[PDB]
């Protein structure tokens, strides 16, 4: 599912990311934009053989299983296909361990380039929330 730029920050506000961490709300937008373009399915596969799935793109290596990726980790605890759904359940509380366990949001390099040190308030603009 192709979600709206609202939709899904108000969906990523239902679930607590909204400071998350102190990471706001628009800064989790402004890395799925980037990371998937708001697309739930968007899967990239890598050359070690691994995936990275929906909305944030979150990789098969170490996060979720998907039964083809070598080294069998899974530290969400979760098969890789529910990071595909149209309910974002699993992939907000996958990204939640993300952020909790390294360098903050520096997970994700898309946020990295365009996001950190910029004004992401601009990201939920006109949202009803």
Same mark, same amino acid.
């Given at each position: 599912?192709?979600?709206? !730029? ?7 506000? !239902?679930?607590?990311? @909204? ?11 402004? %890395?799925? /934009? ?6 739930? &399915?968007?899967?990239? !596969?890598?050359?070690?053989?691994? #995936? @990275?799935?929906?909305?944030? &793109? $979150? ?6 299983? *998907? ?10 605890? $979760? ?7 149209? @309910? $974002? #359940? %699993? #992939?907000?509380?996958? %990204?939640?361990? +993300?952020?909790? *366990? ?5 997970? =994700?390099?898309? =946020? !990295?380039?365009?996001? /950190?040190?910029? *004004?992401? &308030? %601009? =990201? +939920? ?5």
């Amino acid at each position: 599912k192709v979600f709206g !730029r609202c939709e899904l920050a108000a969906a990523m506000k !239902r679930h607590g990311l @909204d400071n998350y961490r102190g990471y706001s709300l628009g800064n989790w937008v402004c %890395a799925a /934009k980037f990371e998937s373009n708001f697309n739930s &399915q968007a899967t990239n !596969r890598n050359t070690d053989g691994s #995936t @990275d799935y929906g909305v944030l &793109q $979150i990789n098969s290596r170490w996060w979720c299983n *998907d039964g083809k990726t070598p080294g069998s980790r899974n530290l969400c605890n $979760i098969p890789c296909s529910a990071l595909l759904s149209s @309910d $974002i #359940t %699993a #992939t907000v509380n996958c %990204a939640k361990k +993300i952020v909790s *366990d390294g360098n903050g949001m520096n997970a =994700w390099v898309a =946020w !990295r380039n365009r996001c /950190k040190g910029t *004004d992401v &308030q %601009a =990201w +939920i603009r006109g949202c009803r929330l």
